Enzyme design. Structure first.
Site, PDB file in Angstrom:
ATOM      1  N   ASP A 180      43.161  33.231  33.557  1.00  0.00           N
ATOM      2  CA  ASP A 180      43.548  32.789  34.893  1.00  0.00           C
ATOM      3  C   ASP A 180      42.386  32.905  35.872  1.00  0.00           C
ATOM      4  O   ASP A 180      42.595  33.217  37.051  1.00  0.00           O
ATOM      5  CB  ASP A 180      44.762  33.596  35.381  1.00  0.00           C
ATOM      6  CG  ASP A 180      45.564  32.892  36.472  1.00  0.00           C
ATOM      7  OD1 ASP A 180      45.484  31.650  36.611  1.00  0.00           O
ATOM      8  OD2 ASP A 180      46.299  33.606  37.195  1.00  0.00           O
ATOM      9  N   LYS A 186      39.974  31.849  38.549  1.00  0.00           N
ATOM     10  CA  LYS A 186      39.943  30.853  39.612  1.00  0.00           C
ATOM     11  C   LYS A 186      39.634  31.588  40.909  1.00  0.00           C
ATOM     12  O   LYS A 186      39.757  32.809  40.961  1.00  0.00           O
ATOM     13  CB  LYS A 186      41.282  30.109  39.717  1.00  0.00           C
ATOM     14  CG  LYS A 186      42.464  30.988  40.058  1.00  0.00           C
ATOM     15  CD  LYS A 186      43.767  30.280  39.798  1.00  0.00           C
ATOM     16  CE  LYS A 186      44.926  31.210  40.052  1.00  0.00           C
ATOM     17  NZ  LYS A 186      46.189  30.689  39.470  1.00  0.00           N
ATOM     18  N   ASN A 243      41.757  34.473  42.350  1.00  0.00           N
ATOM     19  CA  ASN A 243      41.759  35.753  41.650  1.00  0.00           C
ATOM     20  C   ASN A 243      40.429  36.494  41.736  1.00  0.00           C
ATOM     21  O   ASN A 243      40.251  37.507  41.046  1.00  0.00           O
ATOM     22  CB  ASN A 243      42.170  35.563  40.191  1.00  0.00           C
ATOM     23  CG  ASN A 243      43.651  35.336  40.040  1.00  0.00           C
ATOM     24  OD1 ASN A 243      44.457  35.904  40.786  1.00  0.00           O
ATOM     25  ND2 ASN A 243      44.027  34.494  39.088  1.00  0.00           N
ATOM     26  N   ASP A 267      43.538  40.228  39.435  1.00  0.00           N
ATOM     27  CA  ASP A 267      44.855  40.060  38.835  1.00  0.00           C
ATOM     28  C   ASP A 267      44.688  39.828  37.344  1.00  0.00           C
ATOM     29  O   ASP A 267      43.683  39.261  36.907  1.00  0.00           O
ATOM     30  CB  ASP A 267      45.635  38.877  39.408  1.00  0.00           C
ATOM     31  CG  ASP A 267      47.085  38.860  38.937  1.00  0.00           C
ATOM     32  OD1 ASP A 267      47.859  39.719  39.427  1.00  0.00           O
ATOM     33  OD2 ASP A 267      47.447  38.017  38.074  1.00  0.00           O
ATOM     34  N   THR A 293      46.569  27.289  36.547  1.00  0.00           N
ATOM     35  CA  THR A 293      46.372  26.257  37.556  1.00  0.00           C
ATOM     36  C   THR A 293      45.643  25.066  36.943  1.00  0.00           C
ATOM     37  O   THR A 293      44.555  25.243  36.383  1.00  0.00           O
ATOM     38  CB  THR A 293      45.571  26.838  38.716  1.00  0.00           C
ATOM     39  OG1 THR A 293      46.331  27.889  39.328  1.00  0.00           O
ATOM     40  CG2 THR A 293      45.273  25.774  39.759  1.00  0.00           C
TER      41      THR A 293
HETATM   42  O1  LIG Z   1      48.146  37.536  45.971  1.00  0.00           O
HETATM   43  C1  LIG Z   1      47.999  37.968  44.872  1.00  0.00           C
HETATM   44  C2  LIG Z   1      46.861  38.943  44.531  1.00  0.00           C
HETATM   45  C3  LIG Z   1      46.526  39.860  45.436  1.00  0.00           C
HETATM   46  C4  LIG Z   1      45.628  41.078  45.719  1.00  0.00           C
HETATM   47  C5  LIG Z   1      44.881  41.326  46.870  1.00  0.00           C
HETATM   48  C6  LIG Z   1      44.125  42.500  46.946  1.00  0.00           C
HETATM   49  C7  LIG Z   1      44.141  43.409  45.880  1.00  0.00           C
HETATM   50  O2  LIG Z   1      43.401  44.602  45.910  1.00  0.00           O
HETATM   51  C8  LIG Z   1      44.889  43.131  44.751  1.00  0.00           C
HETATM   52 CL1  LIG Z   1      44.927  44.255  43.379  1.00  0.00          CL
HETATM   53  C9  LIG Z   1      45.626  41.978  44.670  1.00  0.00           C
HETATM   54  C10 LIG Z   1      48.940  37.586  43.709  1.00  0.00           C
HETATM   55  C11 LIG Z   1      48.778  38.201  42.466  1.00  0.00           C
HETATM   56  C12 LIG Z   1      49.616  37.870  41.402  1.00  0.00           C
HETATM   57  C13 LIG Z   1      50.620  36.919  41.579  1.00  0.00           C
HETATM   58  O3  LIG Z   1      51.467  36.581  40.508  1.00  0.00           O
HETATM   59  C14 LIG Z   1      50.788  36.302  42.818  1.00  0.00           C
HETATM   60  C15 LIG Z   1      49.948  36.638  43.881  1.00  0.00           C
HETATM   61  O4  LIG Z   1      50.114  36.020  45.125  1.00  0.00           O
END
Ligand SMILES: O=C(/C=C/c1ccc(O)c(Cl)c1)c1ccc(O)cc1O
Length: 275
Positions: free
Chosen positions: A137, A139, A142, A159, A178
């Site tokens: 994944d 992109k 992420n 992620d 995606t």
């Molecule tokens: O927004 C996401 C990721 C965010 C993030 C931001 C700051 C961080 O430190 C960490 Cl660990 C994660 C997200 C992840 C998985 C999913 O299925 C759907 C999502 O929207």
């Protein structure tokens, strides 16, 4: 495998929302006992065997198992896992400088800026691939920055919801990633390995250098058809001052046959990257 079933709100306070998807929401949080800050990813559990809503426990346990194995500057560190009847809650390292997707919209990048980011992505993927972990994944959404107000921001892959161990060289499962970023073997429902990530890196590199997405169509089906046919080109309007070696790097990643595509080690030895 069971997780901590005490109420997460007894141990953490939540704050700003960091992101939101179909089956997960990520909230900034603070551990009461230490004052340390994290990102709490709330994953909606499946409520019946035959349901399509929520995430299967097998999928959640796979993501947790991968996160527990990894520790590298360019990947997030898992802190704790809680669960209740509705959710599994992953307490993850907080990366607060924003997406690679948002920081680029402020500025295309020069080749130096692009390679500074790209080298960090390659280092994180080299670590994952060394452990036989395919991310599946990769992109811009992420890839996030630790601090966006520095000249060379540091990044982390944030992620792991589609990541899989590849202990037999390939896995035969559907990856609903995606369209703009998935490799032809994903589009064609073929066995998948580490090579799929290298294609995604090629797409990311194309976007970093140009601001344009190489396969994007007007519909998802067009994008997927473009990917499978390797229907992309370097538009002169966007690439006229980009070096031929940068294009060569991309060209050796956006290769339909996974066996002919550059591996992660190839990408680190490629003359555009190798010091
Ligand atoms: O927004 C996401 C990721 C965010 C993030 C931001 C700051 C961080 O430190 C960490 Cl660990 C994660 C997200 C992840 C998985 C999913 O299925 C759907 C999502 O929207």
């Amino acid at each position: 495998t069971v997780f901590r079933q005490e109420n997460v709100d007894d141990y953490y306070d939540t704050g700003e929302e960091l992101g939101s998807g179909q089956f997960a929401v990520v909230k900034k949080c603070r551990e009461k006992s230490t004052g340390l800050q994290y990102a709490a990813k709330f994953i909606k559990k499946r409520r019946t065997k035959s349901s399509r809503r929520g995430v299967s426990r097998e999928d959640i346990e796979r993501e947790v198992s991968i996160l527990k194995e990894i520790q590298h500057p360019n990947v997030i560190t898992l802190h704790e896992v809680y669960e209740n009847k509705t959710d599994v809650i992953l307490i993850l390292e907080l990366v607060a400088g924003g997406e690679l997707f948002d920081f680029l919209a402020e500025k295309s990048l020069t080749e130096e800026e692009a390679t500074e980011f790209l080298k960090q992505i390659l280092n994180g993927v080299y670590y994952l691939h060394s452990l036989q972990i395919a991310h599946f994944d990769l992109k811009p959404e992420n890839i996030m920055l630790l601090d966006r107000n520095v000249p060379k921001p540091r990044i982390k892959i944030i992620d792991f919801g589609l990541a899989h161990k590849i202990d037999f060289g390939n896995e035969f499962k559907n990856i609903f990633g995606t369209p703009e970023f998935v490799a032809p073997e994903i589009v064609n429902y073929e066995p998948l390995g580490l090579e799929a990530d290298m294609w995604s890196i090629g797409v990311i590199t194309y976007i970093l250098l140009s601001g344009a997405s190489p396969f994007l169509g007007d519909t998802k089906q067009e994008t997927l058809a473009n990917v499978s046919a390797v229907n992309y080109e370097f538009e002169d309007e966007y690439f006229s001052n980009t070096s031929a070696l940068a294009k060569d790097f991309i060209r050796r990643l956006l290769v339909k046959d996974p066996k002919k595509r550059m591996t992660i080690q190839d990408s680190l030895q490629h003359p555009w990257i190798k010091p």
